[PDB]
């Protein structure tokens, strides 16, 4: 019933899971494909450049289980509390999400990766839908970061 939510979740969940597992997944394909490739290029870069800061942030969050996920949900909402939305903030959140997914994999909480992806998708689709639609969704995401 909500195609933008479904597509966004598909892109974000796939990226978070393949970052965690190290293998891509086998199971709107055109736009989603390009977005994922874009996310790999750009998102990996963010994690590399800001690995130290990401580590510090993770420790302060103290994520041990599914209920800890709400604490990231509150943090992510706070990011946009200044009324500003752009692709830079969105990719940064998705990148930190991938970083957290890696952490969940290392602490044997792999089942927490999906709820993680859903909470990130909740913040972006549920609270920033109008902006996302204005950017032509993930097609605009791909165009914004085209090189």
């Amino acid at each position: 019933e909500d195609e933008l939510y479904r597509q966004s979740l598909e892109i974000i969940s796939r990226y978070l899971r393949e970052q965690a597992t190290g293998a891509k997944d086998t199971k709107s394909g055109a736009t989603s494909r390009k977005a994922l490739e874009t996310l790999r290029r750009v998102g990996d870069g963010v994690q590399r450049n800001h690995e130290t800061a990401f580590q510090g942030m993770l420790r302060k969050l103290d994520i041990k289980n599914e209920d800890d996920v709400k604490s990231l949900s509150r943090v992510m909402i706070h990011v946009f509390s200044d009324g500003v939305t752009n692709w830079g903030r969105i990719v940064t959140l998705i990148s930190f999400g991938a970083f957290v997914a890696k952490h969940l994999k290392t602490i044997n909480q792999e089942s927490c990766i999906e709820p993680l992806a859903e909470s990130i998708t909740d913040v972006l689709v549920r609270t920033k839908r109008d902006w996302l639609v204005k950017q032509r969704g993930w097609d605009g995401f791909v165009e914004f970061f085209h090189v």
Binding site: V46, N49, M57, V75, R89
Partner: peptide
Amino acid sequence: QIARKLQCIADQFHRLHVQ
């Protein structure tokens, strides 16, 4: 704060990638 740091990082990301 974590949210403020993520904001800062997002800002660095843009300034590094603007062309």
